[PDB]
């Protein structure tokens, strides 16, 4: 029911042409952060969305991950945030899906990865492979 609400905010992205408003992302985030007891289901729903959504929503879906993890780290502390560690489990697969996006949108993905590294959102054993993955795509 906390999860139902989050699911409802997340999937209502399909009502909107990106760019998505700050307000909508904040709504999705608050639903996630308020559903923190069920963080595993929240991560699962975000990953499912990223797997299934149309190409135009890949960056929105990544911004959901960004927004949730950065809010959580700020609200609960970097040490204590459950979101980034749980997102880390499947994150390589998650990015494989994110990169089925319009070519014009890859620069946005790399920008978030860069910010994540600078802000130590994920430890470098996570971030660098993801960064490696972006580099490898323009080559092919």
């Amino acid at each position: 029911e906390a999860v139902k609400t989050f699911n409802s905010e997340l999937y209502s992205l399909n009502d909107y042409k990106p760019p998505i408003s700050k307000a909508k992302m904040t709504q999705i985030t608050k639903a996630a952060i308020k559903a923190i007891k069920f963080y595993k289901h929240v991560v699962q729903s975000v990953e499912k969305f990223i797997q299934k959504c149309k190409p135009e929503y890949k960056v929105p879906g990544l911004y959901v991950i960004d927004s949730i993890v950065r809010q959580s780290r700020h609200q609960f502390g970097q040490e204590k945030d459950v979101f980034a560690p749980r997102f880390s489990n499947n994150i390589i697969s998650t990015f494989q899906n994110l990169y089925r996006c319009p070519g014009d949108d890859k620069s946005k993905i790399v920008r978030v990865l860069n910010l994540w590294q600078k802000n130590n959102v994920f430890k470098s054993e996570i971030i660098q492979p993801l960064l490696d993955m972006a580099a490898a795509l323009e080559h092919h």
Binding site: P19, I20, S21, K22, K24, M25, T26, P60, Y63, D66, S67, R70, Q71, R73, H74, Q75, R111, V112, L115
Partner: peptide, 10 residues
């Protein structure tokens, strides 16, 4: 949304 936007707090 911007990935540099400030997080919310009291």
């Amino acid at each position: 949304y911007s990935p540099t936007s400030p997080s919310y707090s009291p």
